[PDB]
mmCIF file of all heavy atoms in Angstrom:
data_model
loop_
_atom_site.group_PDB
_atom_site.id
_atom_site.type_symbol
_atom_site.label_atom_id
_atom_site.label_comp_id
_atom_site.label_asym_id
_atom_site.label_seq_id
_atom_site.Cartn_x
_atom_site.Cartn_y
_atom_site.Cartn_z
ATOM 1 N N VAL C 1018 77.737 -38.954 3.220
ATOM 2 C CA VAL C 1018 78.766 -38.941 4.258
ATOM 3 C C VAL C 1018 80.158 -38.729 3.674
ATOM 4 O O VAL C 1018 81.114 -38.476 4.411
ATOM 5 C CB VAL C 1018 78.753 -40.239 5.076
ATOM 6 C CG1 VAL C 1018 77.373 -40.464 5.660
ATOM 7 C CG2 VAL C 1018 79.175 -41.415 4.206
ATOM 8 N N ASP C 1021 81.543 -33.459 3.174
ATOM 9 C CA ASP C 1021 81.619 -32.772 4.467
ATOM 10 C C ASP C 1021 80.552 -31.688 4.629
ATOM 11 O O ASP C 1021 79.954 -31.552 5.697
ATOM 12 C CB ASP C 1021 83.013 -32.166 4.667
ATOM 13 C CG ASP C 1021 84.085 -33.224 4.899
ATOM 14 O OD1 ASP C 1021 83.754 -34.295 5.448
ATOM 15 O OD2 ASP C 1021 85.258 -32.988 4.534
ATOM 16 N N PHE C 1057 93.452 -60.431 -1.942
ATOM 17 C CA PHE C 1057 93.496 -59.135 -1.299
ATOM 18 C C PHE C 1057 94.775 -58.379 -1.682
ATOM 19 O O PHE C 1057 94.773 -57.139 -1.753
ATOM 20 C CB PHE C 1057 93.381 -59.307 0.231
ATOM 21 C CG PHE C 1057 93.743 -58.084 1.004
ATOM 22 C CD1 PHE C 1057 92.897 -56.991 1.025
ATOM 23 C CD2 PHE C 1057 94.940 -58.024 1.708
ATOM 24 C CE1 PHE C 1057 93.231 -55.844 1.725
ATOM 25 C CE2 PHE C 1057 95.276 -56.881 2.419
ATOM 26 C CZ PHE C 1057 94.423 -55.795 2.425
ATOM 27 N N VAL C 1058 95.854 -59.110 -1.964
ATOM 28 C CA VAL C 1058 97.137 -58.465 -2.262
ATOM 29 C C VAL C 1058 97.080 -57.614 -3.548
ATOM 30 O O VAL C 1058 97.916 -56.733 -3.751
ATOM 31 C CB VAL C 1058 98.285 -59.504 -2.372
ATOM 32 C CG1 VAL C 1058 98.204 -60.284 -3.673
ATOM 33 C CG2 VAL C 1058 99.655 -58.823 -2.252
ATOM 34 N N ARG C 1062 95.121 -49.105 -4.563
ATOM 35 C CA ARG C 1062 95.157 -48.032 -3.568
ATOM 36 C C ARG C 1062 93.835 -47.260 -3.505
ATOM 37 O O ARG C 1062 93.294 -47.007 -2.418
ATOM 38 C CB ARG C 1062 96.317 -47.080 -3.865
ATOM 39 C CG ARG C 1062 96.513 -45.982 -2.830
ATOM 40 C CD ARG C 1062 97.674 -45.067 -3.207
ATOM 41 N NE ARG C 1062 98.871 -45.822 -3.574
ATOM 42 C CZ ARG C 1062 99.858 -46.106 -2.733
ATOM 43 N NH1 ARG C 1062 99.784 -45.707 -1.466
ATOM 44 N NH2 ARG C 1062 100.911 -46.803 -3.149
ATOM 45 N N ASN C 1070 87.212 -44.721 3.443
ATOM 46 C CA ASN C 1070 86.459 -43.468 3.504
ATOM 47 C C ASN C 1070 84.967 -43.691 3.755
ATOM 48 O O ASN C 1070 84.399 -43.126 4.690
ATOM 49 C CB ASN C 1070 86.681 -42.669 2.206
ATOM 50 C CG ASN C 1070 86.190 -41.229 2.302
ATOM 51 O OD1 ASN C 1070 86.160 -40.638 3.382
ATOM 52 N ND2 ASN C 1070 85.789 -40.661 1.164
ATOM 53 N N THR C 1077 83.074 -41.769 12.135
ATOM 54 C CA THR C 1077 83.695 -40.662 12.870
ATOM 55 C C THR C 1077 83.143 -39.316 12.380
ATOM 56 O O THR C 1077 82.820 -38.429 13.180
ATOM 57 C CB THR C 1077 85.222 -40.695 12.715
ATOM 58 O OG1 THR C 1077 85.744 -41.906 13.309
ATOM 59 C CG2 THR C 1077 85.866 -39.490 13.380
ATOM 60 N N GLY C 1100 84.209 -60.836 9.398
ATOM 61 C CA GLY C 1100 85.344 -60.677 8.506
ATOM 62 C C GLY C 1100 86.254 -59.505 8.849
ATOM 63 O O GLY C 1100 87.336 -59.356 8.284
ATOM 64 N N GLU C 1102 87.253 -59.290 11.984
ATOM 65 C CA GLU C 1102 88.091 -59.866 13.043
ATOM 66 C C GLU C 1102 88.917 -61.043 12.554
ATOM 67 O O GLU C 1102 90.035 -61.278 13.018
ATOM 68 C CB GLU C 1102 87.248 -60.370 14.214
ATOM 69 C CG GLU C 1102 86.226 -59.435 14.817
ATOM 70 C CD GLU C 1102 85.339 -60.190 15.817
ATOM 71 O OE1 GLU C 1102 85.895 -60.878 16.708
ATOM 72 O OE2 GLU C 1102 84.095 -60.147 15.688
ATOM 73 N N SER C 1117 88.955 -51.402 10.688
ATOM 74 C CA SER C 1117 89.140 -49.979 10.936
ATOM 75 C C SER C 1117 87.899 -49.388 11.624
ATOM 76 O O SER C 1117 88.006 -48.550 12.533
ATOM 77 C CB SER C 1117 89.437 -49.275 9.592
ATOM 78 O OG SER C 1117 89.601 -47.894 9.759
ATOM 79 N N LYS C 1123 85.829 -48.230 19.220
ATOM 80 C CA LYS C 1123 86.536 -48.153 20.505
ATOM 81 C C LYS C 1123 87.094 -46.762 20.787
ATOM 82 O O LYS C 1123 86.888 -46.218 21.872
ATOM 83 C CB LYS C 1123 87.673 -49.169 20.560
ATOM 84 C CG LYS C 1123 87.190 -50.619 20.475
ATOM 85 C CD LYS C 1123 88.404 -51.540 20.345
ATOM 86 C CE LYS C 1123 88.014 -52.995 20.119
ATOM 87 N NZ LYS C 1123 89.215 -53.799 19.661
ATOM 88 N N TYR C 1124 87.815 -46.186 19.829
ATOM 89 C CA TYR C 1124 88.380 -44.853 20.070
ATOM 90 C C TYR C 1124 87.282 -43.784 20.202
ATOM 91 O O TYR C 1124 87.438 -42.827 20.986
ATOM 92 C CB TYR C 1124 89.389 -44.484 18.983
ATOM 93 C CG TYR C 1124 90.760 -45.057 19.290
ATOM 94 C CD1 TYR C 1124 91.154 -46.297 18.787
ATOM 95 C CD2 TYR C 1124 91.644 -44.377 20.129
ATOM 96 C CE1 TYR C 1124 92.408 -46.829 19.086
ATOM 97 C CE2 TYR C 1124 92.888 -44.904 20.440
ATOM 98 C CZ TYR C 1124 93.266 -46.123 19.910
ATOM 99 O OH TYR C 1124 94.500 -46.639 20.232
ATOM 100 N N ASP C 1128 86.339 -41.374 23.442
ATOM 101 C CA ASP C 1128 86.175 -39.919 23.288
ATOM 102 C C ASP C 1128 84.848 -39.400 23.805
ATOM 103 O O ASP C 1128 84.796 -38.363 24.471
ATOM 104 C CB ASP C 1128 86.271 -39.491 21.822
ATOM 105 C CG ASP C 1128 87.664 -39.552 21.274
ATOM 106 O OD1 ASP C 1128 88.659 -39.494 22.038
ATOM 107 O OD2 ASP C 1128 87.752 -39.655 20.035
ATOM 108 N N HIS C 1132 80.861 -37.311 27.289
ATOM 109 C CA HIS C 1132 79.730 -36.487 26.874
ATOM 110 C C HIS C 1132 78.417 -37.238 27.022
ATOM 111 O O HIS C 1132 77.379 -36.774 26.560
ATOM 112 C CB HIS C 1132 79.902 -36.016 25.424
ATOM 113 C CG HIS C 1132 81.205 -35.329 25.173
ATOM 114 N ND1 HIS C 1132 81.442 -34.024 25.544
ATOM 115 C CD2 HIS C 1132 82.352 -35.774 24.606
ATOM 116 C CE1 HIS C 1132 82.676 -33.692 25.212
ATOM 117 N NE2 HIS C 1132 83.252 -34.736 24.643
ATOM 118 N N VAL L 230 106.333 -45.132 -0.521
ATOM 119 C CA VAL L 230 105.246 -46.100 -0.585
ATOM 120 C C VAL L 230 103.905 -45.500 -0.998
ATOM 121 O O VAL L 230 102.945 -46.239 -1.209
ATOM 122 C CB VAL L 230 105.064 -46.837 0.770
ATOM 123 C CG1 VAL L 230 106.328 -47.619 1.112
ATOM 124 C CG2 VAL L 230 104.676 -45.847 1.881
ATOM 125 N N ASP L 233 103.133 -45.401 -6.554
ATOM 126 C CA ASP L 233 103.021 -46.749 -7.111
ATOM 127 C C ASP L 233 104.119 -47.073 -8.110
ATOM 128 O O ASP L 233 104.603 -48.210 -8.187
ATOM 129 C CB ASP L 233 101.659 -46.925 -7.764
ATOM 130 C CG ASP L 233 100.554 -47.076 -6.742
ATOM 131 O OD1 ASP L 233 100.784 -47.785 -5.731
ATOM 132 O OD2 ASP L 233 99.476 -46.471 -6.937
ATOM 133 N N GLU L 268 90.485 -35.157 20.686
ATOM 134 C CA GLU L 268 89.591 -36.292 20.645
ATOM 135 C C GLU L 268 89.752 -36.895 19.253
ATOM 136 O O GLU L 268 89.937 -36.174 18.263
ATOM 137 C CB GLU L 268 88.142 -35.878 20.926
ATOM 138 C CG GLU L 268 87.893 -35.415 22.354
ATOM 139 C CD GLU L 268 86.408 -35.214 22.681
ATOM 140 O OE1 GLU L 268 85.539 -35.461 21.812
ATOM 141 O OE2 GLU L 268 86.107 -34.798 23.823
ATOM 142 N N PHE L 269 89.700 -38.216 19.169
ATOM 143 C CA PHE L 269 89.822 -38.870 17.876
ATOM 144 C C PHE L 269 88.645 -38.446 16.979
ATOM 145 O O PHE L 269 88.775 -38.416 15.756
ATOM 146 C CB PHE L 269 89.893 -40.399 18.057
ATOM 147 C CG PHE L 269 89.502 -41.167 16.838
ATOM 148 C CD1 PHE L 269 90.407 -41.350 15.803
ATOM 149 C CD2 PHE L 269 88.216 -41.687 16.716
ATOM 150 C CE1 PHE L 269 90.038 -42.056 14.661
ATOM 151 C CE2 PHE L 269 87.833 -42.386 15.584
ATOM 152 C CZ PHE L 269 88.739 -42.572 14.553
ATOM 153 N N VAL L 270 87.521 -38.073 17.591
ATOM 154 C CA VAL L 270 86.314 -37.691 16.852
ATOM 155 C C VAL L 270 86.540 -36.470 15.949
ATOM 156 O O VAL L 270 85.812 -36.262 14.968
ATOM 157 C CB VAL L 270 85.124 -37.403 17.812
ATOM 158 C CG1 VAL L 270 85.286 -36.059 18.494
ATOM 159 C CG2 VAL L 270 83.789 -37.464 17.067
ATOM 160 N N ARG L 274 89.109 -35.912 7.584
ATOM 161 C CA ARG L 274 89.048 -36.942 6.553
ATOM 162 C C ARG L 274 90.410 -37.141 5.907
ATOM 163 O O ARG L 274 90.852 -38.274 5.716
ATOM 164 C CB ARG L 274 88.006 -36.577 5.497
ATOM 165 C CG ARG L 274 87.690 -37.694 4.523
ATOM 166 C CD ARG L 274 86.668 -37.247 3.466
ATOM 167 N NE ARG L 274 85.472 -36.667 4.070
ATOM 168 C CZ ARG L 274 84.350 -37.335 4.309
ATOM 169 N NH1 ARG L 274 84.252 -38.626 3.993
ATOM 170 N NH2 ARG L 274 83.319 -36.720 4.868
ATOM 171 N N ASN L 282 96.707 -44.676 4.341
ATOM 172 C CA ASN L 282 97.485 -44.872 3.121
ATOM 173 C C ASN L 282 98.930 -45.243 3.425
ATOM 174 O O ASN L 282 99.465 -46.233 2.924
ATOM 175 C CB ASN L 282 97.434 -43.599 2.262
ATOM 176 C CG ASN L 282 97.996 -43.809 0.864
ATOM 177 O OD1 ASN L 282 97.897 -44.900 0.294
ATOM 178 N ND2 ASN L 282 98.585 -42.763 0.307
ATOM 179 N N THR L 289 100.320 -53.773 1.977
ATOM 180 C CA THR L 289 99.758 -54.487 0.840
ATOM 181 C C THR L 289 100.463 -54.117 -0.473
ATOM 182 O O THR L 289 100.797 -54.990 -1.292
ATOM 183 C CB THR L 289 98.263 -54.210 0.742
ATOM 184 O OG1 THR L 289 97.621 -54.793 1.887
ATOM 185 C CG2 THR L 289 97.675 -54.815 -0.521
ATOM 186 N N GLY L 312 97.923 -50.165 20.729
ATOM 187 C CA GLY L 312 96.865 -49.217 20.425
ATOM 188 C C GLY L 312 96.041 -49.587 19.206
ATOM 189 O O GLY L 312 95.023 -48.966 18.952
ATOM 190 N N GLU L 314 94.794 -52.619 19.039
ATOM 191 C CA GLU L 314 93.861 -53.605 19.616
ATOM 192 C C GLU L 314 92.966 -53.018 20.693
ATOM 193 O O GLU L 314 91.822 -53.421 20.858
ATOM 194 C CB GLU L 314 94.617 -54.773 20.258
ATOM 195 C CG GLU L 314 95.572 -55.520 19.367
ATOM 196 C CD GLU L 314 96.356 -56.554 20.156
ATOM 197 O OE1 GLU L 314 95.732 -57.519 20.660
ATOM 198 O OE2 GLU L 314 97.587 -56.382 20.299
ATOM 199 N N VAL L 325 93.599 -46.611 14.818
ATOM 200 C CA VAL L 325 92.708 -47.107 13.779
ATOM 201 C C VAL L 325 93.537 -47.578 12.591
ATOM 202 O O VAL L 325 93.240 -48.608 11.960
ATOM 203 C CB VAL L 325 91.670 -46.003 13.410
ATOM 204 C CG1 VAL L 325 90.759 -46.447 12.303
ATOM 205 C CG2 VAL L 325 90.852 -45.687 14.659
ATOM 206 N N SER L 329 93.771 -51.508 10.966
ATOM 207 C CA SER L 329 93.735 -51.834 9.534
ATOM 208 C C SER L 329 94.965 -52.637 9.133
ATOM 209 O O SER L 329 94.886 -53.588 8.349
ATOM 210 C CB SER L 329 93.660 -50.558 8.679
ATOM 211 O OG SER L 329 92.435 -49.899 8.886
ATOM 212 N N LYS L 335 96.462 -60.380 8.339
ATOM 213 C CA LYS L 335 95.699 -61.622 8.269
ATOM 214 C C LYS L 335 95.227 -61.940 6.845
ATOM 215 O O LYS L 335 95.406 -63.062 6.364
ATOM 216 C CB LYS L 335 94.506 -61.546 9.208
ATOM 217 C CG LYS L 335 94.891 -61.538 10.679
ATOM 218 C CD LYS L 335 93.639 -61.315 11.521
ATOM 219 C CE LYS L 335 93.969 -60.949 12.966
ATOM 220 N NZ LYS L 335 92.747 -60.388 13.625
ATOM 221 N N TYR L 336 94.636 -60.962 6.167
ATOM 222 C CA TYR L 336 94.197 -61.203 4.789
ATOM 223 C C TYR L 336 95.383 -61.454 3.835
ATOM 224 O O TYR L 336 95.281 -62.299 2.940
ATOM 225 C CB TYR L 336 93.301 -60.054 4.296
ATOM 226 C CG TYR L 336 91.873 -60.211 4.780
ATOM 227 C CD1 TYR L 336 91.445 -59.625 5.987
ATOM 228 C CD2 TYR L 336 90.955 -60.971 4.062
ATOM 229 C CE1 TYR L 336 90.153 -59.793 6.433
ATOM 230 C CE2 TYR L 336 89.658 -61.146 4.514
ATOM 231 C CZ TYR L 336 89.259 -60.556 5.695
ATOM 232 O OH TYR L 336 87.969 -60.747 6.142
ATOM 233 N N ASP L 340 96.277 -64.925 1.612
ATOM 234 C CA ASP L 340 96.606 -64.832 0.179
ATOM 235 C C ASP L 340 97.916 -65.504 -0.194
ATOM 236 O O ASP L 340 98.002 -66.224 -1.186
ATOM 237 C CB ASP L 340 96.749 -63.378 -0.254
ATOM 238 C CG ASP L 340 95.448 -62.661 -0.385
ATOM 239 O OD1 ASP L 340 94.384 -63.309 -0.501
ATOM 240 O OD2 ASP L 340 95.514 -61.409 -0.404
#
Side-chain angles (χ1 to χ4, degrees):
Chain C
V1018 304
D1021 289 330
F1057 166 73
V1058 74
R1062 184 181 312 265
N1070 193 28
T1077 296
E1102 309 171 51
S1117 179
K1123 297 172 185 166
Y1124 276 93
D1128 287 337
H1132 306 282
Chain L
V230 298
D233 286 319
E268 292 189 2
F269 158 81
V270 76
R274 190 182 308 264
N282 191 32
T289 294
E314 304 174 65
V325 178
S329 294
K335 292 174 194 165
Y336 279 92
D340 285 341

